[PDB]
Amino acid sequence: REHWATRLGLILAMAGNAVGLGNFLRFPVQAAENGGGAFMIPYIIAFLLVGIPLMWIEWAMGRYGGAQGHGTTPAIFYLLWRNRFAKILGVFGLWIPLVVAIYYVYIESWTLGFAIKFLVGLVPEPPPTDPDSILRPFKEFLYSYIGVPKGDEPILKPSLFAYIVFLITMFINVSILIRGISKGIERFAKIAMPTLFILAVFLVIRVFLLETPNGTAADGLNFLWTPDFEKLKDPGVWIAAVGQIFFTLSLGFGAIITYASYVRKDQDIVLSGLTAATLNEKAEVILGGSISIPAAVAFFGVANAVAIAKAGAFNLGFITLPAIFSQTAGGTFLGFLWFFLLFFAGLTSSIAIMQPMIAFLEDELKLSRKHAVLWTAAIVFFSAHLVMFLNKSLDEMDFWAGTIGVVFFGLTELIIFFWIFGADKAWEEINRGGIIKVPRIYYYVMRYITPAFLAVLLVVWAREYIPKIMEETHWTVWITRFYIIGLFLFLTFLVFLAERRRNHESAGT
Ligand SMILES: CCCCCCCCO[C@@H]1O[C@H](CO)[C@@H](O)[C@H](O)[C@H]1O
Ligand SMILES: CCCCCCCCO[C@@H]1O[C@H](CO)[C@@H](O)[C@H](O)[C@H]1O
Ligand SMILES: CCCCCCCCO[C@@H]1O[C@H](CO)[C@@H](O)[C@H](O)[C@H]1O
Ligand SMILES: CCCCCCCCO[C@@H]1O[C@H](CO)[C@@H](O)[C@H](O)[C@H]1O
Ligand SMILES: CCCCCCCCO[C@@H]1O[C@H](CO)[C@@H](O)[C@H](O)[C@H]1O
Ligand SMILES: CC(C)C[C@H](N)C(=O)O
Ligand SMILES: [Cl-]
Ligand code: NA
Ligand code: NA
């Protein structure tokens, strides 16, 4: 089995798995929509009670499976719980990353497309004070790129450039993945992470120089880091905080598990896992939190900045920030740097969510890496046409797989590993080979707190939120639901074929 060549490579690859669009695009919007500082308390608590414990559990499960030649959940869940139902639940460890990859790679392609256009100066020319006269050109720019509907039909009409850039983006992802773990993902992470860090720091510095009649970047930081204990009783903020923690740490996506399956059986995962998690958090709250929000607040003030964040998931990062940058000397190049940063952040994460399907095809169906990577790319490329042409399909996939799915899967992996497999066996497995040991208190957090926490969260979700999503949405959501349910059935069929191949292989041995 392939293995990470170096310790630093492993850490940076895992850090790249985590540090992505979630840190720079998702976090700012989530924090802004939820009262900034009022979001941070639940966020920090979720990191301590859910993020950290699940990260260790996923690293442990992956390393455990890898030692037996398995890097994906259909097989790993079965190793932990010898029940056919384990294999089926395990399918989510292939389905979630595949579905998320389908829309995540497309959004990643937008950052490459924007980076290219901003680099070459093919950007809107706002009329040099009306806030709408400046923002409108950038909104039109994004809308023409992805092809937002101008009428009643829920159809998107992406520009030819956007389509070609998606092709290029898939090719770049393939070029890295086809080289494998050590020579592909690891080697790239050693280049991309330092680059991402430098670009992010530079952008934070430039943003911190922003001062307008409406405010300064400092006003943005105060908004984000000022506690608001009167929201701690709001379920919505907690659901948002936990959701962000899962997304940003790549938890419940089967991605951490697969990457960990390449860690040598004897190698530490306690310190390594904690480090990857900490690096992500610093990149999220310190870097991601200090770019978009402070810039928006400095130029528009808090009230307007919050309204912008609530506008959409892409308004702040693809419209507002470049519009703000356009009002400064060298602003177009600053926009280029921002989108280049987003592209590298996305790329290091997209290769991580495609690797689970690749590992499954290699490990269970015995395909060569070349064939596994190409077929995985083919499925993602084909499937992405749904997200590129059907309005709000992206939103539907992000909901079932990237929001509900990951929390459900996180709870599932915890129950299977810490309850069914055995709390003490699990604890032993996590700490084996550790450079440091997991604090004793976390044994109780993992066994009792985390699952209870997630269970309650899921119940409240299915009661006070999803019913509106099942009855208050446009009929076209069923097109996406139908397709992704089909993807689940397809993956289940592949797991079925994998078990049949194993049976025939065992009979011949
Ligand atoms: C393998 C799956 C193929 C699905 C058919 C995809 C057809 C895409 O069609 C292409 O879309 C681009 C972006 O809108 C346009 O710019 C091109 O002119 C158009 O030919
Ligand atoms: C990285 C290289 C990407 C090449 C993509 C080229 C897509 C060509 O696309 C065409 O470009 C013309 C000029 O901008 C426009 O006037 C056309 O409407 C557009 O369809
Ligand atoms: C569910 C996903 C279905 C994807 C099918 C896409 C078929 C593309 O359809 C094509 O798109 C082009 C650009 O938008 C148009 O210029 C062509 O006239 C149209 O036929
Ligand atoms: C599920 C989402 C699909 C989005 C792609 C919509 C393409 C709609 O485009 C339409 O397709 C018709 C059928 O070929 C053509 O007859 C029309 O001329 C064309 O405009
Ligand atoms: C609810 C999650 C809290 C996480 C914070 C853990 C802080 C670690 O706490 C430390 O753990 C060590 C090992 O068990 C003990 O020996 C120390 O006395 C204790 O202070
Ligand atoms: C799906 C995950 C790979 C996403 C990544 N953790 C991010 O923050 O963008
Ligand atoms: Cl375009
Ligand atoms: Na992240
Ligand atoms: Na990344």
Side-chain angles (χ1 to χ4, degrees):
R1 187 178 193 69
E2 275 213 76
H3 289 119
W4 300 100
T6 63
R7 185 61 158 184
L8 176 62
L10 163 63
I11 298 303
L12 296 183
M14 282 283 200
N17 180 322
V19 180
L21 302 178
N23 302 59
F24 299 102
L25 294 180
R26 202 179 191 287
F27 176 75
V29 170
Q30 296 301 308
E33 295 187 310
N34 293 289
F39 175 76
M40 298 309 288
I41 294 302
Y43 180 82
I44 293 172
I45 294 173
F47 177 64
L48 298 174
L49 299 176
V50 177
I52 289 299
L54 280 188
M55 179 65 79
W56 280 320
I57 286 170
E58 285 197 31
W59 274 73
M61 294 178 73
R63 183 182 61 163
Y64 181 76
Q68 289 181 63
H70 300 291
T72 58
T73 49
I76 294 175
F77 277 9
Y78 191 62
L79 295 179
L80 301 176
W81 177 34
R82 301 289 183 171
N83 188 293
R84 190 64 66 273
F85 195 58
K87 296 176 183 177
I88 300 173
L89 289 175
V91 174
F92 281 103
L94 295 184
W95 183 79
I96 292 176
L98 179 67
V99 172
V100 174
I102 291 167
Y103 66 87
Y104 195 99
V105 181
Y106 186 41
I107 297 168
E108 169 183 314
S109 73
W110 305 353
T111 67
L112 177 59
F114 273 56
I116 293 172
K117 300 186 83 69
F118 274 72
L119 177 61
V120 181
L122 297 174
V123 300
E125 310 184 307
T129 60
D130 183 2
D132 271 299
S133 65
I134 302 178
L135 285 172
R136 189 181 303 97
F138 286 91
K139 174 169 291 298
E140 303 181 321
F141 186 82
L142 172 63
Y143 283 30
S144 300
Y145 186 90
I146 64 180
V148 175
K150 296 180 293 294
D152 300 297
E153 304 180 307
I155 303 308
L156 296 163
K157 205 300 194 313
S159 69
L160 177 55
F161 179 62
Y163 191 77
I164 293 175
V165 173
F166 178 61
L167 284 168
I168 293 169
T169 298
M170 286 300 313
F171 175 74
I172 294 173
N173 274 264
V174 168
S175 72
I176 295 165
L177 291 166
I178 203 162
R179 293 192 192 301
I181 301 303
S182 66
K183 299 182 175 183
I185 300 178
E186 195 178 345
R187 290 198 184 299
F188 183 69
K190 288 187 173 183
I191 301 172
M193 299 317 288
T195 296
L196 186 168
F197 176 65
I198 296 173
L199 289 173
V201 172
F202 181 71
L203 287 168
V204 170
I205 295 172
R206 181 70 192 75
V207 166
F208 280 15
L209 293 177
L210 296 176
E211 163 144 34
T212 80
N214 297 311
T216 68
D219 296 313
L221 294 180
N222 295 319
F223 165 67
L224 179 67
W225 298 97
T226 295
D228 189 304
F229 305 114
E230 296 189 301
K231 296 300 298 180
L232 297 176
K233 291 66 181 180
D234 190 306
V237 181
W238 284 93
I239 289 183
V242 177
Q244 176 62 29
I245 285 297
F246 268 90
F247 194 93
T248 197
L249 287 177
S250 301
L251 301 173
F253 292 89
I256 294 298
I257 292 179
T258 296
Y259 266 31
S261 80
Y262 300 112
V263 177
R264 291 179 183 290
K265 182 177 60 60
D266 48 290
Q267 222 183 315
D268 159 89
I269 60 177
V270 180
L271 182 60
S272 288
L274 177 63
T275 298
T278 297
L279 284 174
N280 178 75
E281 292 312 302
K282 290 181 183 175
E284 177 134 310
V285 307
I286 303 176
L287 301 180
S290 301
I291 297 172
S292 309
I293 293 305
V297 175
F299 267 65
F300 300 106
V302 181
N304 288 313
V306 172
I308 289 176
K310 292 181 178 298
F314 306 114
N315 287 260
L316 186 57
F318 287 91
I319 297 175
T320 303
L321 194 58
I324 287 169
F325 286 175
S326 79
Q327 298 303 102
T328 67
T332 301
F333 190 74
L334 192 58
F336 157 68
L337 293 180
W338 164 242
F339 292 112
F340 191 82
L341 167 60
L342 295 183
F343 179 61
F344 261 27
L347 180 53
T348 50
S349 289
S350 63
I351 55 184
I353 43 178
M354 283 188 278
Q355 184 64 204
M357 183 62 175
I358 291 162
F360 170 78
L361 296 174
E362 299 173 329
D363 302 341
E364 318 309 332
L365 290 185
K366 301 300 185 298
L367 281 64
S368 64
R369 177 171 65 215
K370 177 186 180 180
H371 290 166
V373 173
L374 294 179
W375 277 108
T376 294
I379 299 171
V380 174
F381 176 70
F382 170 74
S383 297
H385 286 73
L386 185 54
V387 173
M388 298 188 276
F389 291 98
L390 183 62
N391 192 43
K392 302 311 178 187
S393 177
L394 179 161
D395 303 53
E396 195 61 18
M397 294 193 192
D398 177 71
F399 177 67
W400 296 104
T403 304
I404 302 301
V406 301
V407 177
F408 165 73
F409 200 57
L411 175 58
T412 297
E413 53 185 25
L414 189 161
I415 291 172
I416 293 183
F417 190 57
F418 239 76
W419 287 6
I420 301 180
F421 180 61
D424 302 309
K425 297 172 66 181
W427 183 254
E428 172 81 320
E429 188 58 38
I430 296 169
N431 287 293
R432 186 175 58 65
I435 292 175
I436 58 174
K437 288 191 178 182
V438 177
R440 184 191 177 73
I441 188 60
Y442 266 117
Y443 169 88
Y444 299 96
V445 172
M446 299 177 168
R447 186 171 182 175
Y448 309 111
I449 309 301
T450 308
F453 193 67
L454 298 183
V456 178
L457 186 70
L458 288 174
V459 175
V460 177
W461 220 319
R463 291 182 177 178
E464 305 297 302
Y465 294 109
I466 71 172
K468 308 171 186 175
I469 301 178
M470 290 297 276
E471 189 181 303
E472 286 298 310
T473 55
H474 189 257
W475 71 265
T476 52
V477 300
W478 284 104
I479 299 170
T480 300
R481 292 174 182 175
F482 173 72
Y483 187 70
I484 65 179
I485 288 172
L487 286 176
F488 189 91
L489 296 175
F490 162 67
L491 294 168
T492 299
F493 183 58
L494 294 191
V495 169
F496 170 84
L497 292 182
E499 44 179 48
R500 289 301 164 298
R501 176 199 52 64
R502 176 198 169 192
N503 292 172
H504 178 291
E505 181 179 57
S506 299
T509 58

